[PDB]
Amino acid sequence: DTMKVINDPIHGHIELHPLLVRIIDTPQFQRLRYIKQLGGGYYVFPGASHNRFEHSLGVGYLAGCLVHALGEKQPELQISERDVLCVQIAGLCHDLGAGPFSHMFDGRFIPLARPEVKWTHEQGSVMMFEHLINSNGIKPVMEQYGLIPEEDICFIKEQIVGPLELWPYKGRPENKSFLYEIVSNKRNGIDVDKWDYFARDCHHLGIQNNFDYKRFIKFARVCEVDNELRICARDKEVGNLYDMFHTRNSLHRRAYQHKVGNIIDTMITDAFLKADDYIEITGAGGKKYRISTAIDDMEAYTKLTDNIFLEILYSTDPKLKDAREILKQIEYRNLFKYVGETQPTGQIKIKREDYESLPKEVASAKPKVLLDVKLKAEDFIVDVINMDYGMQEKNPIDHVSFYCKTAPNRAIRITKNQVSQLLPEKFAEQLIRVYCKKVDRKSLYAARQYFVQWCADRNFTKPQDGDVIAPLITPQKKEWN
Amino acid sequence: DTMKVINDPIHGHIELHPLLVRIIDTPQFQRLRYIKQLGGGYYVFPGASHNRFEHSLGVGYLAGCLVHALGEKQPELQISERDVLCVQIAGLCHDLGAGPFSHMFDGRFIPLARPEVKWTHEQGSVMMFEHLINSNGIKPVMEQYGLIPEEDICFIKEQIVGPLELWPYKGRPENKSFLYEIVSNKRNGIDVDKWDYFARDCHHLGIQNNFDYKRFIKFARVCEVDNELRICARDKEVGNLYDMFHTRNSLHRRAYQHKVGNIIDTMITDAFLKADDYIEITGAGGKKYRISTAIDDMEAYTKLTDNIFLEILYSTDPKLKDAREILKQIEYRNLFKYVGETQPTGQIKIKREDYESLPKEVASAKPKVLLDVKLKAEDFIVDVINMDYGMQEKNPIDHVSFYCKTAPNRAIRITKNQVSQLLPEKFAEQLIRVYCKKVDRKSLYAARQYFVQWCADRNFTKPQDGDVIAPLITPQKKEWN
Amino acid sequence: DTMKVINDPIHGHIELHPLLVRIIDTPQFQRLRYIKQLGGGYYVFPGASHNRFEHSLGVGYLAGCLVHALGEKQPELQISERDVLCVQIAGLCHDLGAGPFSHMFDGRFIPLARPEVKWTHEQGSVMMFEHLINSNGIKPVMEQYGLIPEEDICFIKEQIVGPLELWPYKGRPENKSFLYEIVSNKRNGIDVDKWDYFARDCHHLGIQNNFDYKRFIKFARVCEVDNELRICARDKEVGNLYDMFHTRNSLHRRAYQHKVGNIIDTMITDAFLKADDYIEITGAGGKKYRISTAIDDMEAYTKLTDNIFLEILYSTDPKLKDAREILKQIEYRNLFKYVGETQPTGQIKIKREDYESLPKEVASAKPKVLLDVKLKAEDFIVDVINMDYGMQEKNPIDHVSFYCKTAPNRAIRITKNQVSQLLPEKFAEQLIRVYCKKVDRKSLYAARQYFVQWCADRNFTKPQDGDVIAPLITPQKKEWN
Amino acid sequence: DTMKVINDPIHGHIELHPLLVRIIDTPQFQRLRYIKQLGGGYYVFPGASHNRFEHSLGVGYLAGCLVHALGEKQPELQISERDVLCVQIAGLCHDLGAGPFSHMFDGRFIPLARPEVKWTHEQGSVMMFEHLINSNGIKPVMEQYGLIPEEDICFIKEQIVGPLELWPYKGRPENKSFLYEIVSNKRNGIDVDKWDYFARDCHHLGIQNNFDYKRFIKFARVCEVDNELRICARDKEVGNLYDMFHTRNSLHRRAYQHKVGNIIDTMITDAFLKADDYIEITGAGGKKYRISTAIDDMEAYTKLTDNIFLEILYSTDPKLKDAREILKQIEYRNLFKYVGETQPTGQIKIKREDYESLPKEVASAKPKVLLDVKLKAEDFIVDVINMDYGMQEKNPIDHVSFYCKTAPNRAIRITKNQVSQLLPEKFAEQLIRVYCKKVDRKSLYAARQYFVQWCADRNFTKPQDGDVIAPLITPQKKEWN
């Protein structure tokens, strides 16, 4: 069979090898048509209707581009078409574990529904990949195209999830180390996955992207670093790399962590939690699963998509009333009310196990103001957001290797002070958003008082609108004035 | 409650008047989030994931822009903000009647499922608008903002569907005739609906748009034409108008009538037909409706979206197997095979009552060829496509009024001969596509022989691949040599 | 000496081989930075400030892209590194013969200044290329990078200008005929030169076209046609090809032949004609040349760019007063006034021999109206423009070869009747613009009367604004209603 | 007479009031067509051929957009069409004082040619505006459109250059203070000039823009701040503001201060210095001026554009030989060699009085390497570049006023700590680039040794490629290891 050409609004005309086509045309891959890339973000940015499917095509394409470029500039690397196909397949299949509304599912729902389990999106992708391969007879097509299914399937999985557990990989040896930096870069976070979603999300959101992946590809080489051949960027391109991470941060501030988008993800998750006992998804054998248990059976998970939303919204069963009602309130735009935003000060970090107690803290605050209404713990929502450069408190550029034009095969390192003094001094912070479920004027007022008092007691930052929303609280706070 | 700003990737930041927001935040309008603008086109162009929702937003916005422009350039027209709001509401609500997969529903499915009924997309939009209004207490909100519900609701409906069936409109008199030309121009098809979907579809498909609606708006005026005030374009802009329709035609040939997109629409429709007896959609009172009859109850139709596709796909009920299988074959990319394309010659038009007889005609033919495998009528699909400039055989530019720079309040007409000799000689044609449901090598060979013989017998145009797919048949037709 | 990466707003990051860089960094090439691509068009479209330099880079690049794609899809063509470099150089240098204001120079100025000489842009490019090579010691660099200067220099020139005097080319044999279809396609006009200026001019003008060269490249193959290996397009891409020419026509209608742009080209050409005796350009040995004779010495022509405009504009010598004044009137925007536009009918063409005589005719007509101030022939300008599909009366798609997917190695032909009846029936037409050098109210009125009467007498098309500018004249002609 | 529509690739179709058209169609304004926006940058980014003309149109337009938007949103500000016209004219004319290659002229050339005179670009623009007005009879045209020349010309000048001397402005009273923040914001640098060149320069450079000015305009209001009426942004837009300045910094890093671009500006400046004694520009009365003295006579400065470059390049006079040689060395791409880049450490700032002594410091350094060639001070170039957020050491966002959704007319302040911990800690830094005029391998090696030795001695930052370009020097510095 022959190659297919496909037209993508981001990358243009992409060539798809017949093996890739065989992989794409399976229920396991096509399911990605029914999962929105940005989930609840679509309910704030109406252009964001794009799905995981097209993004996956993009990542496969981009993975291919990088490996190809590397190969043509450096034939001594012995990059084979087999290598190219494996990196392409890895890029294509990286997101196969996506659940309903993408990262709402693994980031919000599963942690609340199944706290005992260790679930990652990537593990999901490996399992779903295995299921695709075994359910569609892919191994003989792989062999037909020069792949060796054992090592190569191992390699693809390793590209997606990391080492399956000092060279920890089995799919490829150290002299092909660079191949593991293409799809998901565990070392510094610089990969083609990011490059695709920056561009694609920007295209759909109506926000413009300022990162040029093509330039990066032009300037990329492979050099020896610690007895492995790794990808190195050109030294003077370091500025661009800092900008890339800045871009990432910007996209999170403007879109991915938009206050309303997040509150909508929250409400939908609440609906799924109230629906979990009663929704049935039929997997292997005819066995029944729940939304929270579909992850245990790939045939059921294959059928778990954004559809569940609509299944709940359109239901007539009384047992789903509660869930249904919540979704209906989303349609009427009767959302939880944003009360405010604050940050911790000094060294103070908030841990996830402390998240659960935060609404209790806010309601327990004691403002010295006349309050019509007393508010409870369940009236508040506290969303904690980690904003960083992808490596917690670390500078990812400290984990990038560079080359100089005068000696292109010699890897070097570049420190932050060698670049600019206008760069961040810290690379991680927390944003605390507080919302109130009671929508009346007085409850909202009260909630503002509770919130600002709470910020004052914990020495958090002064809310930007503090002097307007709670003028009796902010002045009696040494700093904030 | 204040105005909202929304960020659209096509138009940028749009202001939404609180009345519009009240209309948008209803189940009848939010419903459009679950219907793909281009339906089956998404299975060919992976960027085409956009839904009717954002498009309706865009059209409302642009209607607003045009009316506002007309108003600020010519205050003597007495355009009120009430007029602006009514025009905006009409733009927002024109597609309220969209069914699953947009024009697949009213264009393919409903005509086959219920041939006796006269259902149009627009009338559907009117009924759904009425339903939204009554189910959400909009009338007093309209009144709150200076609208007069009887006249204005009548006006909005008239803008969507035309005269509800001597000046035929009741919502506005002849001296505001131009207002009826903004949302859906029944006279020549030049309206803001088209502008939005050209721009938007081009953005998602990965095809670049070459029509400049902002320029058109800049050059628009209103002049007296036969005792009504109508929209007139600048004379010198006539070329652009021809180009617009050319653009329209291009999009239809590149995207909207794509051979695979159409066969996918055909298969989906076939599945919906096979599922029709068994799917239940709960409408008013709790009464059950089917996919083909949901159009009889707006409460039921509200819940009729692209979701059914998945409901059929995810089903386990044996009664749905047939339907299900069809959808599954789409997932495996086992589509009916494109055999070829031809056109009629001379004066010959194919009428709709004769569509049904075309596969039998193809199935008949005597290719005088080595007869491999015999094929039956039910093995063929024949799709007839009417390609025109929107007014059947008529030139729409003959129904446009122009003004010249030396006398901008004086309307004139421009004939085709006054423009260019490189323009089309005909403004309507028919396209005949033939596919075969038997997908094997020999069946395909056979189908090609039957098809070319059929083209020869009907004196149709010679297929482009004719000399290759049927080399024993093409020489027997002098005209083709 | 390594490759350089250069960033182009149209094509992105382009790689330039050291040989190409050596060619670029010469006075003969850098000269193209000082010559505007669209000449007078910048005085109508303020974004059109781009120069021939960047465009030449673009064409070199695209030429390379096409030949590389062909090579990798079909290794049996034996396309060498040398072939790629020669085609790139051809693209790079196809415009070396550009004169001040580009096509104003060879299209308007030289024919008026020296009607006896045979000057073309292409021959100018061959001459300038020879000069660049010889003045900068390029030949040994060519051999240093694997080129064979005699054969390859011949090949490059042939790519630019066509056969230097049956297989007429000496640079490459018939089995590489396809290489001659890349930079300048004399057979059908489909080349990378067009692709680049379509994209670039659109980028700068602020108008967009819908032609996708990248898609074309994806679908291009080389097949056998008449003992030649020629480039063939995929059959179903024929529509796009027709569209490509539509695009061309549109760009000419909107931008390249803009009425005001053309009148500015006319005025600048007049200033240059009036300046020719007095501007001195120093050529070889120190010999002096004029603007019209610099083409006789490449050392002088090297210094002949748009700069001359400013020299004339900034001059103080009385011998240049006339030239200067004209340019000054351009700065004050006192341009000749457009009076109107009309066309001839079907089978009769106006050939160059009559252009000179057209103003006398207009002034000669006797419009039965009160006109106080009579105009002479010298008060008029008549610009007639040939609009075609690039091959006079011919359909260029009749000269395109195609292949179908069932047999990609077999070239076939496709007729207009096989594609659509919505296409043009004719492929060439003439446009007549009339201007008046007298700019006062009464002179303008008079001019309108004369012009419309002239249209009436000659049975040309009715001017679009005819009933407005000459309401006393149009009633004498029944056909015009 | 009437308005003109003009098509700009950045802003689309702009309307120009007849007064603006009158101002534009003068030699003083049209002059801007012959001065490149980015000067020497065109010799690095080939798309950057745009001139000051189109940019000035853009700023006029945007100024109009902002004042207009403020006007419809808050009629209580009493913004008149007279105010709108005056702001448009100021935007239109802010750059009239541009010299050849824009900021090369006022930034490099004039300080070297005439260090005694105090010339700014802005004062230049004011003088040139006065000249335009007086030489073209603009005043009665101003009066014709409702403007009052005495007050209004003053207003325009004040908008460009600031107070010509409580409330320091005379053109408009304090209740129109916000009008002075539109074209050139002397308070915090947030103005429409920046918005336009960010967008335009990005469009031409092939760099993508990340700032959304339209969104800013939607969220802009006027509020009372410290007994003055100022433009305030919505609180939540604070992030966008920080990003805006980041964007600015990025544009300076990638394009405006590109090392090769700067060295090309440097060489051009030297050529102008060697040409100054010999080039003649004819000013008022017939008096002769130099490149360096043309600023003393507006009639002469009108004729001072990028043309001088070509005059020098095309000259034959022996007295200009040296100058000529320099330009020729640019054409052959024989440029001064970039040696390296470094920064001071800690609190150490380099003072401007010390710039001249730096090449001497570098040449005086004694690297312990065996050198063939010794270099002198005149062989080195040391470029010190101030990179900041537009207000030297200050955070400009500390000089921005914000408003909250709950009380849109109550201005507030927002501190850096209320926004993010990932923001710059410093807002100003110094960049030191070193180049060598000797271009042979050995001199370049030597220059590198001298340079890195100098960096070590001054305790500057370690050059990024230090260990590669100078491996015998870097180990001597503990701080660098």
Ligand SMILES: Nc1ncnc2c1ncn2[C@H]1C[C@H](O)[C@@H](COP(=O)(O)OP(=O)(O)OP(=O)(O)O)O1
């Ligand atoms: N004229 C066009 N311009 C831009 N994109 C197009 C055009 N036509 C189709 N596309 C898109 C749709 C697909 O995503 C991709 C490939 O389409 P296409 O070439 O029509 O494949 P196809 O499979 O239907 O034809 P075939 O099987 O005969 O090769 O490009």
Ligand SMILES: Nc1ncnc2c1ncn2[C@H]1C[C@H](O)[C@@H](COP(=O)(O)OP(=O)(O)OP(=O)(O)O)O1
């Ligand atoms: N920084 C941004 N840049 C571009 N678009 C944005 C940005 N932030 C949000 N958007 C989009 C999302 C929405 O479509 C639109 C409005 O967003 P936003 O201003 O955040 O409204 P909001 O309703 O959440 O805030 P508020 O109610 O306080 O005014 O702009």
Ligand SMILES: Nc1ncnc2c1ncn2[C@H]1C[C@H](O)[C@@H](COP(=O)(O)OP(=O)(O)OP(=O)(O)O)O1
């Ligand atoms: N950060 C950037 N982003 C986009 N384009 C850039 C950037 N920096 C430079 N450019 C452009 C300018 C040129 O057209 C092209 C090449 O520039 P550049 O990489 O700086 O080459 P260079 O010759 O100055 O460096 P070097 O010789 O050290 O390799 O890219």
Ligand SMILES: Nc1ncnc2c1ncn2[C@H]1C[C@H](O)[C@@H](COP(=O)(O)OP(=O)(O)OP(=O)(O)O)O1
């Ligand atoms: N069809 C077009 N599409 C886009 N831009 C155009 C088109 N035609 C012209 N332009 C540009 C060029 C100018 O910048 C601007 C105005 O052009 P145009 O409307 O033709 O002015 P004009 O002065 O020649 O006509 P007139 O004086 O008769 O109204 O738009």
Ligand SMILES: [Mg+2]
């Ligand atoms: Mg809001």
Ligand SMILES: [Zn+2]
């Ligand atoms: Zn991903």
Ligand SMILES: [Zn+2]
């Ligand atoms: Zn529509």
Ligand SMILES: [Zn+2]
């Ligand atoms: Zn060209």
